Amino acid sequence: GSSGSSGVHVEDALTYLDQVKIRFGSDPATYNGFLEIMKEFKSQSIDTPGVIRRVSQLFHEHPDLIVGFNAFLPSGPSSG
DSSP: OOOOOOOOOSOOSHHHHHHHHHHTSSOHHHHHHHHHHHHHHHTTSSOHHHHHHHHHHHGGGOHHHHHHHHHHSSOSSSOO
């Protein structure tokens, strides 16, 4: 058929988080860098478009993840 799971409940943040760990299981070095990248944002150091710059480079070998996140993100042009 086709691999795909539609319908994401509100609380859909950690979801993408874990995925990063699973994909980069044998490669902990990659995951680590990601953890730090977040901190920056959690410290009011970078902005939405700022965290993406770091991620991109990190998941450079994974274009599917870099793009997936963008959309995945809850925030957007949607009401609110």
